[PDB]
């Protein structure tokens, strides 16, 4: 009984960890919709600087 | 006149590289023309460099 409950807890834990990882990824600011273009030209935008 | 003259001589040295600068009549008019030309070339060289780098990126 102890081995069986142990397996169920592990499966739930692995699923829980994977979910947290995905949520963290989806909350990345660069992925989030059309923030109003930045008013300042990004240092990485070489064309606008030129 | 002494500053414009220096700019012209430096510019001519840059353009003619390792070749001895040819002797020319240094008068007020020849210096003005050379000076306008030097300013124009410098401004265009800058513009062309920026365009060339951008085209590489594109």
3-state secondary structure chain A: CHHHHHHHHHHHHHHHHHHHHHHHHHCCCCCCCCCCCCCCCCCCCHHHHC
Q: What residues of chain A, 20 to 49, have a C-beta less than 8 Å from chain B? A: 46-47
Look at A47 and B54 and tell me if their CB atoms are within 8 Å: yes
Distance CA B41, CA B36 (A): 9
- Residue B56 sits at the vertex; the CA angle it makes with B53 and B58, to the nearest 5 degrees, is 110
Distance CA B39, CA B45 (A): 10
Closest-CA residue to B30 (of B56, B3, B52, B5): B5
A50 CB near a chain B CB, below 8 Å?
A: yes
Distance CA A19, CA A13 (A): 10
CB B30 within 8 A of CB B24: yes
Q: Copy the structure tokens of residue B21.
A: 């600068």
**Residue from B48, B51, B54 to probe the interface with A (highest A Cβ count within 10 Å):** B54
3-state secondary structure labels for all residues of B1-58? CHHHHHHHHHHHHHHHCCCCCCCCCCCHHHHHHHHHHHHHHHHHHHHHHHHHHHHHHC
Site of tokens 């397996």: A7
HSE-up (13 A, CA, CB side) for residue B46: 6
Beta carbon pairs, A and B, within 8 Å: 8
Q: Looking at chain A, which residue has its C-alpha nearest residue B57?
A: A47
Q: Copy the structure tokens of residue B12.
A: 């001519």
Instruction: Note the Cα B58 to chain centre separation in Å.
Output: 29
Q: Copy the structure tokens of residue B15.
A: 């353009």
Resolution in A: 33.0
């Amino acid at each position: 009984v102890y081995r069986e409950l142990g397996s169920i807890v592990q499966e739930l834990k692995e699923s829980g960890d994977k979910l947290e990882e995905r949520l963290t990824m989806l909350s990345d600011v660069n992925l989030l919709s059309a923030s109003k273009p930045r008013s300042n030209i990004d240092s990485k935008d070489l064309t606008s600087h030129r | 006149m002494d500053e414009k003259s220096t700019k012209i001589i430096m510019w001519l040295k840059k353009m003619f590289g390792d070749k001895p600068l040819p002797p020319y009549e240094v008068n007020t008019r020849t210096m003005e023309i050379l000076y306008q030309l030097a300013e124009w070339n410098e401004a265009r060289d800058k513009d062309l460099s920026l365009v060339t780098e951008d085209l590489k990126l594109k």
